[PDB]
């Protein structure tokens, strides 16, 4: 604001769980603010998200970025996380943001599963959210769950087990049952304001077809396919992802 | 079980919320179990729900009935409840029931908004749930939120407030935003096993069309329109709804 600028650690509560986040506070009495959502098994302080936050703050756009339940410093077991309760975390964070008296426009920015959170939350709040940036939004998680193959880990999609050993973690059965019937595009499509879609052509984790589909369903969207980029927009690709995001939002 | 019969309080956690419930425990080493779900602003111990649980227990069908988040004895503010986090409560109850070694078949019984929770939970667990009874299930909560009128409380459906005073309570705006796009019939239709639909013809809170619609969508449903019954199946209609429910579950 006019008096304080910089970082602070913030904590919110959703259904008895603490959510830990980082706020970047820019100059000025009034400013826009982005809520930035990390992906599946990630956290709020990946290099991509730290750099999005930094780049937006460089343009006087505030941001908050939280660890979802079951991730980073936030409460709850990973086994108990679903995309639905991450949407609930997102709405709790939105509650905090929309009552801040300095905030003018609210933007959502999401990477991967965090992009599914953002897109569905924007379709639930199409009157309140002003712009959305989706980075490699993992809408394919639904089809993957219907097919019985999530990130190479297989199971009967009609007899989902109670819990699924999942690389080094344990993925909840309820995560997969929710994922199969999540109305991702049905809800997301109700957001008719501007959307920026950014997806690496060499993403082997979420097919770039997810972004080509969101681009079809959205009334006012712009698709940026990034030649050769990977799922995480890492290294030599990170700046372009951060640049497109910031430009879209600074307009 | 073979040694204890009767009522007990049970508590479960869902996220960081405690849910408080009542278990009705019948005779016998193995038995079927109904999970019973109350409606909007109700609690686990309404007359109707108590009578259903007792009637099942007399037929050696166990049951549990919990207060949803933001209701009765359970944790959380009412303002923060939605049908979505009720399905999350119902799933935490299902986790408890499905790991009990005495339980044979699992049934869901839901009244009004508890009926939408039951029908959606059964469409998420169509492999596990064996039968579902819905009493006046409130699927019309969706159309009502799209219309901008929830039990006579009004708002612009395209400009839903942050919160809405509602009788002596505070309803959350997110409840309403959820309601408008809730895929009630899409998810519910995945359950292809037997469903009993019980709806009173003089229900003024939830149109009987709600249960006629479920009857169309379900592969295997039986529809009971009880002539003269109101939303709560009050007075003489209560035993009629209870006996249909018990008979169907067996
Ligand atoms: O957030 C990510 O980085 C990846 C998410 C993702 C991608 C594919 C799936 O099947 C799934 O459950 C989650
Ligand atoms: O549970 C009940 O007894 C009634 C539920 C109900 C009925 C109509 C609505 O619009 C609504 O949000 C909830
Ligand atoms: Cl100021
Ligand atoms: Cl990193
Ligand atoms: Cl988050
Ligand atoms: Cl897929
Ligand atoms: Cl990749
Ligand atoms: Cl749209
Ligand atoms: Cl488009
Ligand atoms: Cl007793
Ligand atoms: Cl026993
Ligand atoms: Cl009562
Ligand atoms: Cl709410
Ligand atoms: Cl709200
Ligand atoms: Cl809210
Ligand atoms: Cl469907
Ligand atoms: Cl009535
Ligand atoms: Cl039918």
Author numbering:
A (entry chain A): -5 to 245
B (entry chain B): -5 to 244
Authors' text:
We previously showed that LJ0536, a cinnamoyl esterase purified from L. johnsonii N6.2, is active towards a variety of substrates including short acyl chain aliphatic esters and phenolic esters. The structure showed a canonical α/β fold characteristic of esterases, and the enzyme is dimeric. Two classical serine esterase motifs (GlyXSerXGly) can be recognized from the amino acid sequence, and the structure revealed that the catalytic triad of the enzyme is formed by Ser106, His225, and Asp197, while the other motif is non-functional. The structure revealed a prominent inserted α/β subdomain of 54 amino acids, from which multiple contacts to the aromatic acyl groups of the substrates are made.
We determined the structure of the active site mutant (Ser106Ala mutant) and also co-crystallized this mutant with ferulic acid, ethyl ferulate, or chlorogenic acid. As well, no clear electron density was resolved for the quinic acid moiety of chlorogenic acid (labeled as caffeic acid-bound), perhaps due to residual enzymatic activity, or a lack of productive interactions with the enzyme. The caffeic acid moiety of chlorogenic acid adopts a similar position and interaction with the catalytic pocket, as does ferulic acid. However, caffeic acid has two hydroxyl groups in the benzyl ring (positions 3 and 4) which interact with the side chain of Asp138 and Tyr169 through hydrogen bonding. The 4-hydroxyl group (ethyl ferulate, ferulic acid, and caffeic acid) and 3-hydroxyl group (caffeic acid) of the aromatic ring of the substrates are hydrogen bonded to Asp138 and Tyr169, respectively, from the inserted α/β subdomain at the back of the enzyme cavity. The 3-methoxy (3-hydroxyl in the case of caffeic acid) and 4-hydroxyl groups also interact with an ordered water molecule in all of the complexes. This water is also coordinated by the Oγ1 atom of Thr144 from the inserted α/β subdomain. Conversely, functionalities beyond the ester group, including the alkoxyl group of ethyl ferulate/ferulic acid and the quinic acid moiety of chlorogenic acid, appear not to play roles in substrate binding. This notion is suggested due to the fact that we did not observe electron density for the quinic acid moiety of chlorogenic acid, although the binding cleft is large enough to accommodate this group.
